[PDB]
From a paper:
The PD-1/PD-L1 immune checkpoint, which is one of the best characterized receptor ligands in immuno-oncology, involves PD-1 (programmed death protein 1, also known as CD279) and two known ligands PD-L1 ([name]; [name]) and PD-L2 (B7-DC; CD273). The binding of PD-1 to its PD-L1 ligand limits T-cell activity, thereby preventing excessive stimulation and maintaining immune tolerance to self-antigens. To further investigate the molecular mechanism underlying the PD-L1/KN035 interaction, we solved crystal structures of KN035 complexed with an (IgV) N-terminal immunoglobulin-variable domain of PD-L1 at 1.7 Å resolution and with free PD-L1 at 2.7 Å resolution.
The binding of KN035 induces minor main chain conformational changes in PD-L1 when compared with the free PD-L1 structure solved here or to previous structures of PD-L1. The connecting loop linking strands C’ and D of PD-L1 has shifted ~7.5 Å, which is likely caused by crystal packing. Furthermore, the sidechains of these residues in the KN035/PD-L1 complex largely adopt similar conformations as observed in the free form of PD-L1 structures solved here or previously published. The limited sidechain conformational change during complex formation likely consumes little free energy and favors tight binding.
Residue numbers in the entry:
A (entry chain B): 19 to 227
B (entry chain A): 22 to 230
Amino acid sequence: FTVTVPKDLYVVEYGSNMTIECKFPVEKQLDLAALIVYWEMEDKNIIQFVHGEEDLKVQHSSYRQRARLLKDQLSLGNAALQITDVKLQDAGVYRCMISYGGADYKRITVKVNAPYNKINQRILVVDPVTSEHELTCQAEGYPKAEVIWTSSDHQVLSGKTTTTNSKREEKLFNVTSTLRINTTTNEIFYCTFRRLDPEENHTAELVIP
Amino acid sequence: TVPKDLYVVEYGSNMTIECKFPVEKQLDLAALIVYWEMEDKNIIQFVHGEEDLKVQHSSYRQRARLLKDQLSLGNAALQITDVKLQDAGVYRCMISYGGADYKRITVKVNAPYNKINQRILVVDPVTSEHELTCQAEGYPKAEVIWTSSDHQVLSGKTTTTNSKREEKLFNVTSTLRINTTTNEIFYCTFRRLDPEENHTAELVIPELP
């Protein structure tokens, strides 16, 4: 008897839902009087499954109404922890621990990627005689990002970027950048939100109307 | 024996399919053979405690691996990474240690519209007209249903083409034009039938300077 993990690492996007698995030998059928499943992370209990039931009282405050153990999977020899709406606090080392005659644990590490991939934009005519426009790009993510404006002819341009803490998601940043430029209908520009360590670029295409 | 007969697998993910066999004592890997195939193409040939990767078919060159730490437990776990629609079919496993026996496992590949890209364009701030867009790929064809925070169905413009990335899939992009203000919430729902399946992104109208 030993627990096995088909996936050692999980990379999961902010706000989405994850299923992290642990597999254990089940020759015949589950004797739920003998079955225990314990999920935790950084010494905080997520799930304690005993005598066929989830002990939700011992569940840590953080995970209330978010985490649960898929029970259809238990019959197959698979203890699947599903957590919904992944925060940046859910980055950590997750211990899964099962006792069924023998008893053994495995580790699973989770990283939470919070990309600047929901990009909002605005294009305004500031002065139609000089055909000066104001382009704007906003997005949210973690950590801080810089905005990089480029034209269709690959010219870097000077934008004005304003980084604040997000009024939606406490831990994320709200990055808004503004480009003033002279241009005409159908010309194409790009704003590119750049995170670092490791580098990651998300880019939206603005079409001047 | 096989705990799971049927696997429903996501497109582009990893799958782990399992065949169990009796193991009273420990593994003499000179005596052990494991063979995995689908449609007479070899996926894995494991012999003398080593993967015989020259017999492997082109299709599975660096994708197919046998989880070696789970051989110790009496369970041959075929793992294939980056699942295409071509991986739908019937997989045979055979193992010979002392005795010999085979099991068949059916695999179906779902390609859900669960990676939804979004963007919000402020068209005219005077009227406060915004242009919300959602796009995704999947199979089969899916409709998009736009709804407001109080769940009224709104009129949209949806465009469906064959995907350029993977031509068997479809690209579904939908745009909604609506007069609205900062912090109002909208939903774009990718729906697909026989059987029904819903995936929805939540779009929040931003505060721009």
